[PDB]
Short mmCIF file of all heavy atoms in Angstrom, two decimals:
data_model
loop_
_atom_site.label_atom_id
_atom_site.label_comp_id
_atom_site.label_asym_id
_atom_site.label_seq_id
_atom_site.Cartn_x
_atom_site.Cartn_y
_atom_site.Cartn_z
N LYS A 58 0.49 10.15 18.45
CA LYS A 58 1.03 8.88 18.02
C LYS A 58 0.35 8.37 16.76
O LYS A 58 -0.84 8.63 16.51
CB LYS A 58 0.82 7.81 19.14
CG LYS A 58 1.44 6.45 18.79
CD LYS A 58 1.28 5.42 19.90
CE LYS A 58 1.89 4.09 19.42
NZ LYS A 58 1.57 2.91 20.32
N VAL A 59 1.12 7.71 15.91
CA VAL A 59 0.53 7.10 14.71
C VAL A 59 0.86 5.63 14.91
O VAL A 59 1.98 5.26 15.23
CB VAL A 59 1.22 7.61 13.44
CG1 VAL A 59 0.72 6.72 12.24
CG2 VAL A 59 0.89 9.06 13.19
N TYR A 60 -0.15 4.78 14.85
CA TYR A 60 0.06 3.34 14.97
C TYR A 60 -0.83 2.50 14.11
O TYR A 60 -1.90 3.01 13.69
CB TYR A 60 -0.06 2.88 16.45
CG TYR A 60 -1.31 3.21 17.18
CD1 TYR A 60 -2.45 2.40 17.08
CD2 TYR A 60 -1.40 4.35 17.99
CE1 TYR A 60 -3.63 2.73 17.76
CE2 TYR A 60 -2.56 4.69 18.69
CZ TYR A 60 -3.67 3.87 18.54
OH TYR A 60 -4.82 4.21 19.26
N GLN A 61 -0.43 1.30 13.82
CA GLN A 61 -1.19 0.40 12.99
C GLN A 61 -2.38 -0.18 13.75
O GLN A 61 -2.32 -0.37 14.95
CB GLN A 61 -0.33 -0.71 12.43
CG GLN A 61 0.84 -0.13 11.61
CD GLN A 61 1.59 -1.26 10.89
OE1 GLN A 61 2.04 -2.25 11.49
NE2 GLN A 61 1.77 -1.07 9.56
N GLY A 62 -3.40 -0.48 13.00
CA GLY A 62 -4.62 -1.05 13.59
C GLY A 62 -5.65 -0.06 14.08
O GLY A 62 -5.46 1.15 14.01
N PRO A 63 -6.73 -0.58 14.66
CA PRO A 63 -7.82 0.23 15.20
C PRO A 63 -7.41 1.01 16.44
O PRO A 63 -6.43 0.68 17.14
CB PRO A 63 -8.91 -0.79 15.47
CG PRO A 63 -8.14 -2.05 15.82
CD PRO A 63 -7.01 -2.01 14.84
N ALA A 64 -8.12 2.10 16.72
CA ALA A 64 -7.78 2.96 17.86
C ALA A 64 -7.84 2.11 19.18
O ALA A 64 -8.65 1.21 19.32
CB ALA A 64 -8.78 4.06 17.94
N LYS A 65 -6.91 2.36 20.07
CA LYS A 65 -6.86 1.67 21.33
C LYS A 65 -8.12 1.97 22.14
O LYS A 65 -8.63 1.10 22.85
CB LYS A 65 -5.64 2.02 22.12
CG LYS A 65 -4.36 1.45 21.50
CD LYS A 65 -3.15 2.20 22.10
CE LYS A 65 -1.86 1.71 21.43
NZ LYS A 65 -0.83 2.78 21.59
N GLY A 66 -8.59 3.21 22.05
CA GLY A 66 -9.81 3.62 22.71
C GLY A 66 -10.84 3.98 21.61
O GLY A 66 -10.70 3.50 20.51
N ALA A 67 -11.83 4.81 21.91
CA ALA A 67 -12.78 5.18 20.91
C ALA A 67 -12.14 6.14 19.88
O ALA A 67 -11.28 6.95 20.24
CB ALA A 67 -13.96 5.86 21.53
N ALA A 68 -12.54 6.04 18.65
CA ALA A 68 -12.00 7.01 17.66
C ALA A 68 -13.03 8.08 17.51
O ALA A 68 -14.23 7.77 17.48
CB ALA A 68 -11.74 6.29 16.32
N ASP A 69 -12.62 9.34 17.43
CA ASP A 69 -13.56 10.43 17.23
C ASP A 69 -14.17 10.41 15.81
O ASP A 69 -15.36 10.70 15.66
CB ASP A 69 -12.89 11.79 17.46
CG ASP A 69 -12.55 11.98 18.90
OD1 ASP A 69 -13.40 12.41 19.66
OD2 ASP A 69 -11.38 11.71 19.30
N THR A 70 -13.35 10.09 14.85
CA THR A 70 -13.80 10.00 13.46
C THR A 70 -13.09 8.84 12.82
O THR A 70 -11.94 8.57 13.15
CB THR A 70 -13.38 11.29 12.68
OG1 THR A 70 -13.66 12.47 13.49
CG2 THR A 70 -14.21 11.37 11.41
N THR A 71 -13.76 8.20 11.86
CA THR A 71 -13.21 7.08 11.12
C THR A 71 -13.37 7.43 9.68
O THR A 71 -14.43 7.83 9.24
CB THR A 71 -13.95 5.75 11.45
OG1 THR A 71 -13.80 5.50 12.87
CG2 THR A 71 -13.34 4.62 10.66
N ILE A 72 -12.29 7.34 8.91
CA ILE A 72 -12.26 7.70 7.50
C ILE A 72 -11.97 6.42 6.72
O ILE A 72 -11.03 5.70 7.01
CB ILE A 72 -11.17 8.74 7.18
CG1 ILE A 72 -11.44 10.00 8.04
CG2 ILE A 72 -11.20 9.10 5.71
CD1 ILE A 72 -10.84 9.90 9.44
N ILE A 73 -12.80 6.15 5.71
CA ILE A 73 -12.64 4.94 4.87
C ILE A 73 -12.49 5.34 3.42
O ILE A 73 -13.39 6.00 2.85
CB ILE A 73 -13.89 4.00 5.04
CG1 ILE A 73 -14.12 3.65 6.54
CG2 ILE A 73 -13.66 2.68 4.28
CD1 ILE A 73 -15.19 4.53 7.16
N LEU A 74 -11.41 4.95 2.77
CA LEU A 74 -11.19 5.30 1.38
C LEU A 74 -10.12 4.38 0.80
O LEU A 74 -9.36 3.72 1.57
CB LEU A 74 -10.68 6.76 1.28
CG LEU A 74 -9.28 7.09 1.63
CD1 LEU A 74 -9.11 8.63 1.43
CD2 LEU A 74 -8.88 6.78 3.07
N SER A 75 -10.06 4.25 -0.51
CA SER A 75 -9.06 3.40 -1.13
C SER A 75 -7.65 3.96 -1.00
O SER A 75 -7.45 5.18 -0.80
CB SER A 75 -9.40 3.22 -2.64
OG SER A 75 -9.19 4.39 -3.38
N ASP A 76 -6.66 3.08 -1.10
CA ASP A 76 -5.26 3.50 -1.02
C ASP A 76 -5.02 4.52 -2.13
O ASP A 76 -4.35 5.54 -1.90
CB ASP A 76 -4.40 2.22 -1.25
CG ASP A 76 -2.93 2.55 -1.10
OD1 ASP A 76 -2.50 3.05 -0.02
OD2 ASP A 76 -2.14 2.27 -2.03
N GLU A 77 -5.54 4.25 -3.31
CA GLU A 77 -5.33 5.18 -4.46
C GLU A 77 -5.92 6.57 -4.18
O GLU A 77 -5.28 7.61 -4.48
CB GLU A 77 -5.91 4.56 -5.69
CG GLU A 77 -6.04 5.57 -6.87
CD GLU A 77 -4.67 6.07 -7.37
OE1 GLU A 77 -3.78 5.28 -7.60
OE2 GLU A 77 -4.58 7.30 -7.60
N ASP A 78 -7.11 6.60 -3.67
CA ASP A 78 -7.81 7.87 -3.40
C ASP A 78 -7.11 8.64 -2.29
O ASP A 78 -6.99 9.87 -2.34
CB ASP A 78 -9.28 7.64 -3.11
CG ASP A 78 -10.09 7.44 -4.36
OD1 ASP A 78 -9.54 7.59 -5.48
OD2 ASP A 78 -11.25 7.12 -4.27
#
Side-chain angles (χ1 to χ4, degrees):
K58 184 179 177 189
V59 169
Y60 55 83
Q61 303 188 306
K65 290 163 184 156
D69 292 276
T70 316
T71 300
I72 302 84
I73 305 98
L74 78 178
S75 70
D76 185 55
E77 167 65 47
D78 281 352

